[PDB]
Design a protein around this ligand. Structure first.
Ligand SMILES: O=C(O)c1ccc(C#CCCO)cc1SCc1ccc(Cl)c(Cl)c1
Length: 289
């Protein structure tokens, strides 16, 4: 289970795709079994005081990698957010993978952003999809909105074909310097029926949202609804692009098995697993052709 050279990768995708995606199925099964023989605790996630802070009952934040909110005078569980640090290529905690914030966790969400020096939000969901509530709107439709001590001001919006870029200016009321630029990359193209037919617009979304990262800011916050499926998909695509650039190799299976110890279910389906491969195929074939 070493890194596949970039030249042999598109060839490898053909193999994985053949015989009704048998190879893909084996790999994804191996990913699902990577969790086996591993008891990873998520005690804070399961605490009665924290249960209302979780979007889904079964989508937990592993204790060891969980993002801790600075404590608040009084409660003991005021440190909890359903979020985990996740590694990137050759960088620990390059991301914060989190759920789409609830109405009740808006203050927590925005406090985590401040405390972690987060400069980029990657939103991979629509608020409502196929008539179902996926994420609550945590940012202002226009101008300014207040979430605890974080005052959020919408500065500009660029609505592209498949994604929206919202430039915010954030401020802490308890801080006297107390102003920060936060950019949100929102992937908006979600079909009524079916699911992502093309990898090229997602690849463009990944490249642009990734290049917007500022040195040496905090981790890039990536969320969808549960913050596992599309979040995992983004993290792998982005990390593998970095690996390709640095050493012309790809390690999808190895990297995914590793991040799965950091947040439960990152890359939730075989379809998302296959999608990772298509995005990378597009990136490889795109170079020199
Ligand atoms: O919606 C799903 O959960 C989902 C379900 C299936 C597929 C597939 C496939 C081909 C295999 O048949 C992809 C996605 S998500 C695709 C995606 C969109 C936007 C971004 Cl920014 C990223 Cl990173 C990934």
């Amino acid at each position: 289970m070493e890194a596949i050279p970039v030249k042999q990768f598109v060839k490898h995708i053909g193999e994985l795709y053949s015989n009704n995606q048998h190879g893909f199925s084996e790999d994804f099964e191996e990913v699902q079994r990577s969790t086996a023989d591993m008891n990873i605790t998520a005690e804070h996630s399961n605490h009665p005081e924290n249960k209302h802070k979780n979007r889904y009952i079964n989508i937990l934040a592993y204790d060891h990698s969980r993002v801790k909110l600075r404590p608040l005078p009084g409660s003991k569980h005021s440190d909890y957010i359903n979020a985990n640090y996740v590694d990137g290529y050759n960088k620990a905690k390059a991301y914060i993978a989190t759920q789409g914030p609830l109405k009740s966790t808006f203050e927590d969400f925005w406090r985590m952003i401040w405390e972690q020096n987060t400069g980029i939000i990657v939103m991979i969901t629509n608020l409502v999809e196929k008539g179902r509530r996926k994420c609550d709107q945590y940012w202002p439709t226009e101008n300014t909105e207040e979430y605890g001590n974080i005052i959020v001001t919408l500065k500009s919006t660029k609505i592209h074909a498949c994604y929206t870029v919202r430039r915010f200016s954030i401020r802490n009321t308890k801080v006297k310097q107390n102003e920060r630029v936060v950019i949100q990359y929102h992937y908006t193209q979600w079909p009524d029926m079916g699911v992502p037919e093309y990898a090229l617009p997602v690849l463009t979304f990944v490249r642009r949202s990734s290049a917007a990262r500022m040195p040496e800011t905090g981790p890039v916050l990536v969320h969808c609804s549960a913050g596992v499926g599309r979040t995992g998909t983004y993290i792998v695509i982005d990390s593998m692009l970095q690996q390709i650039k640095d050493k012309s190799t790809v390690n999808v299976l190895g990297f995914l098995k590793h991040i799965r110890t950091q947040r439960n279910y990152l890359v939730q389906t075989e379809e998302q697993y296959i999608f990772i491969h298509d995005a990378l195929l597009e990136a490889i074939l795109g170079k020199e052709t």
